Amino acid sequence: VTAEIRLYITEGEVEDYRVFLERLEQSGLEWRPATPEDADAVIVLAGLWGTRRDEILGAVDLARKSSKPIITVRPYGLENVPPELEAVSSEVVGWNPHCIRDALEDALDVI
């Protein structure tokens, strides 16, 4: 069967970005790298907020014209996300397998 979903992740340089890729792999669910213009789920890491905030900003603008599928993932625990994401954010999760699953099936049921 081909139930894979269209996901997208931002580019980072911290080691948390790699550890995240491995976890998603252990998930087992099928996922494919879709462009940021036609993506169904955009998992953005809040760890690159004090580094590539100018880049993430763009991903948001484009997301404001595609259902705004922007999900914020808490940082490994170095700081705290500001009140500027929960405002234009559609879903927010942390380092959990069930949490990411709730925000995923959320993009499916579009009412």
User: Which CATH number characterizes residue 59's domain?
Assistant: 3.40.50.9200
Which helix or strand (DSSP H or E) is residue 15 part of? helix 15-27
CA-closest candidate to residue 100, choices 1, 2, 7, 3: 7
Spatial neighbors of 45 by CB under 8 A, at least 6 apart, are: 9, 10, 12, 16, 17, 20, 73, 75
- Rounded-to-integer distance, Cα 111 and Cα 108, Å: 9
- Rounded-to-integer distance, Cα 57 and Cα 94, Å: 20
Containing domain of residue 85, as a range?
1-111
User: In the 3-class helix/strand/coil scheme, how is 42-96 assigned residue by residue?
Assistant: EEEEHHHCCCCHHHHHHHHHHHCCCCCCEEEECCCCCCCCCCCCCCCCCEEECCC
Q: Report residue 71 as tokens.
A: 């999900």
In contact, 32 and 5? CB cutoff 8 Å = yes
Q: What's the total number of domains in the chain?
A: 1
What's 111's DSSP letter? -
Across 87-101, b (16+ Cβ under 10 Å) vs e yields eebbbbbeeeeebbe
